[PDB]
Amino acid sequence: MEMEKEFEQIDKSGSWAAIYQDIRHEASDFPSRVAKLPKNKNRNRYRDVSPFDHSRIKLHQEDNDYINASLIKMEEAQRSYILTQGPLPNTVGHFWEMVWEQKSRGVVMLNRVMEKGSLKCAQYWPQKEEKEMIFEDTNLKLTLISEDIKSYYTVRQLELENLTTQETREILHFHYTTWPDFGVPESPASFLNFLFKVRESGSLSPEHGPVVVHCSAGIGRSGTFCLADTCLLLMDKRKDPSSVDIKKVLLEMRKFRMGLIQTADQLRFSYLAVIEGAKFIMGD
């Protein structure tokens, strides 16, 4: 059912809360036993947000392979994403180990380091060219190469060096800096333009490892980004674009990470971005 028509029908009937609870009720429940081991307590930001065992990313080390991160593999769309929490003071070295091992080209950050007067994630990248960062626990060096600051987002070029082999790679950091402290953006224009800049970079393409996407918990804003990208890609691949069912795509993605889309307002915003995004691509 043309999702724009369903959209107006839910708005007029004021039933976003009911639609959102139905998704919550139908969503997959898989074990997360590795996340709950006592040795991993200081590797989780939130007690109620854990990666499933079946889809978790493993660190390549025999000591402790755990990170709060999930592989979202979208079979029909032919896109994969790694969704993860904002790094903690004791997991910044793990974070960059994962980027290195998974062969990612891009990191997408949808939060500010401080929001609502509290820290939402560690300062995990260097702010000045001449002050690089060394992660002694994982043997990596990270240097800021360039920074481009725009009204709604910042793009950074970073150099990651594996100190063990002296290999280097260029990583692109896409930082959406204007998501409001409360609620969702009033217009999906800045977010869709941001999505379009990540795509244009190559960061989402199959010649690279999966893009790493985070916010504070890695389920809410992070969920909105992947859901919008996958829905738009399906609407361009299929003969009948009106067959793309956002609710069904979200439940497929919830097979791989719990809690994607955290509020009925985030669900409404996800609809708005896809609907308004399709008509801009199709030529209009």
Ligand SMILES: O=C(c1c(F)cccc1F)N1CCCCCC1
């Ligand atoms: O002007 C818009 C737009 C729209 F299509 C619908 C509603 C409000 C808007 F602001 N966009 C410009 C860049 C393309 C991706 C974002 C959309």
